[PDB]
């Protein structure tokens, strides 16, 4: 549907420059102490979260190799151990995952 | 007249600044390494006795300037606008630090100094008002206290609700003015001359001069008003968001002069409070606070 005459640039300029059509500023921006990067007040930091996922992938890779087959999910609890930490009696009766890396500072 | 004292007080403050500026020849480069938790290890080459922690914050980002209220130079609290003196390790202190007790004291002292400024100019020049000292009370006490000695003419006068509101208006105007806290370390001899008329201020200058091996004393100036400080103060008066003159308690030994301890509460913009919370805090801040 076309108007019976061409729409003037002046008319068009007013429509696009109306405040309703302009981009709004956001004041909910926050700083992440953990990563030192920006975050939203309702959103978690991704720089630190990225570390968790990367460690999770590495941990998951170790578990997959240890299982050695599909549909081999243990019926017993699982635990992760890093270099410098040795399985204890409390770790008995739990699947033990060994990580070549030392215990991460953030991970406890 | 009080205006004359402020004029001469302002001049000596200005001349001291010139002498310190003249004392330092040329610009000397000092390597300051950032030991702050965020962006650690950055080393800034800075001009000695010229650069301030605010300049370093300007170098990094505006977020640093807005959220930094103080600086930890070699583990020592430093005002954001205090010129740097040597190569050191610098960290920025914020209101949300895990241990803001050092920050709390600086905010506590700065609020007391602002209260003292209000008292001296609140009363008419006809009456005689002399500031005795700013008592140091814990934040847990719930109110910051400033002691002032009034003239005999005011012995029978007690502030009303409107009079207390007038004091807050002066304090609110000072916050609105957003006057930066100027910092000068001055010898007792000059400091004694600056506050010679106020005998009570004279002794406080002597006490600080006595503690340190030298006679250097810490002087802070808000606009024309100047006062001695126990420690570092807030960079600017705009930090406070809520301000209130809760109550005034007259000390019983008022024979030579009527010593009044004024109770007030203030909150920084970084730490806003709910309306009901502020009301309860103001009510809890109207109780006499002793020094223990």
């Amino acid at each position: 549907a076309a108007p019976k005459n061409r729409r003037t640039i002046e008319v068009n300029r007013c429509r696009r420059r109306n405040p309703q059509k302009l981009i709004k500023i956001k004041n909910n921006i926050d700083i992440c102490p953990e990563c030192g990067h920006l975050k939203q007040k309702h959103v978690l930091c991704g720089y630190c979260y990225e570390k968790v996922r990367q460690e999770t992938t590495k941990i998951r890779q170790q578990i997959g190799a240890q299982e050695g087959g599909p549909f081999r999910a243990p019926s017993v609890e699982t635990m992760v151990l890093y270099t410098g930490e040795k399985p204890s009696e409390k770790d008995q009766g739990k699947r033990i995952v060994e990580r070549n890396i030392k215990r991460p500072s953030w991970f406890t | 007249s009080p205006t004359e004292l402020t004029e001469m007080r302002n001049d000596l403050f200005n001349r001291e600044k010139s002498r310190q500026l003249s004392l330092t020849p040329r610009t000397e480069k000092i390597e300051v390494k950032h030991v702050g938790k965020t962006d650690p290890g950055t080393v800034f080459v800075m001009n000695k006795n010229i650069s301030t922690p605010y300049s370093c914050a300007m170098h990094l980002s505006e977020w640093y300037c807005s959220k930094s209220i103080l600086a930890l130079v070699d583990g020592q609290p430093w005002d954001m606008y205090k010129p740097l003196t040597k190569s050191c390790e610098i960290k920025f202190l914020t209101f949300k630090d895990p241990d803001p007790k050092e920050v709390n004291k600086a905010y506590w002292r700065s609020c007391a100094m602002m209260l003292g400024c209000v008292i001296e100019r609140a009363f008419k020049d006809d009456y005689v008002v002399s500031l005795v000292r700013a008592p140091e009370v814990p934040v847990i006490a719930g109110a910051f206290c400033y002691d002032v000695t009034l003239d005999k003419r005011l012995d029978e006068w007690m502030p009303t609700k409107e009079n207390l509101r007038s004091f807050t208006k002066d304090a609110h105007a000072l916050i609105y003015r957003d006057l930066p806290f100027e910092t000068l370390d001055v010898d007792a001899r000059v400091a004694l001359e600056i506050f010679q008329h106020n005998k009570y201020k004279v002794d406080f200058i002597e006490e600080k001069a006595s503690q340190n091996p030298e006679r250097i004393v810490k002087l802070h100036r808000i606009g024309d008003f100047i006062d001695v400080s126990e420690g570092p103060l807030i960079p600017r008066t705009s930090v406070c968001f809520q301000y209130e003159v809760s109550a005034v308690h007259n000390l019983n030994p008022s024979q030579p002069n009527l010593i009044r301890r004024f109770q007030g509460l203030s909150l920084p913009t970084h730490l806003r409070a709910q309306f009901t919370i502020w009301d309860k805090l103001v009510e809890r801040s109207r109780k006499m606070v002793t020094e223990d």
Partner: protein
């Protein structure tokens, strides 16, 4: 085609305290065994090259080349300096305006050491007070003072193509003695960045 060779054939070693300093002139005679045979080689092609009189001719080239910087006389500066020297003088002056002046030389210029199909490089010792002030694109002053004299002692190497009949002495390189003090610092302040690391990585 190259009319100059980068580098110095043999780097002369300056002795500490030479600024305080007959005497040094005799040192060349003592070291003439090392350099006079080289001086003869320049003399063979020219026969008018003398260590005593070269500094005056050398000094003019050094000052004149610096003058071209004020007027950005690139064409003139090409002749004064060798191809190697030209980029060094002007590369860092891009988008900058500089007022450079030469104050009276503190001590007379003297040839210090020379070496040599055949390219002859002559080291000349110059102590001179100069005034330098560099401004930004916007005219803001960023380095030096407009009319303050700074006393600097340096050893300047000029070079000539002996083989070419029209070969002439053109400024090639400068030797900086270790005992010389550091140059004046820039007005603006610099920052040394901290290490950059990936998320999983830790501070070092």
């Amino acid at each position: 085609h190259l009319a100059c060779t980068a580098g110095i054939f043999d780097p002369y070693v300056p002795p500490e305290g030479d600024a305080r300093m007959l005497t040094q002139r005799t040192e060349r005679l003592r070291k003439n065994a090392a350099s006079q045979l080289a001086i003869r080689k320049i003399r063979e092609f020219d026969a008018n090259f003398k260590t005593k009189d070269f500094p005056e001719k050398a000094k003019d080239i050094f000052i004149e080349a610096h003058l071209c910087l004020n007027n950005s006389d690139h064409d003139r500066l090409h002749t004064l300096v060798t191809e190697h020297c030209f980029p060094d003088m002007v590369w860092d002056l891009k988008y900058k305006t500089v007022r450079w002046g030469f104050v009276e030389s503190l001590e007379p210029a003297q040839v210090v050491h020379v070496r040599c199909n055949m390219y002859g490089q002559v080291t000349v010792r110059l102590h001179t007070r100069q005034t330098l002030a560099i401004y930004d694109r916007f005219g803001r002053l960023m380095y030096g003072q407009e009319d303050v004299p700074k006393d600097v002692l340096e050893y300047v190497v000029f070079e000539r193509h002996l083989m070419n009949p029209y070969g002439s002495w053109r400024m090639h390189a400068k030797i900086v003695p270790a005992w010389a003090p550091p140059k004046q610092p820039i007005l603006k302040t610099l920052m040394i960045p901290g290490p950059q690391l990936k998320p999983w990585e830790e501070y070092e």
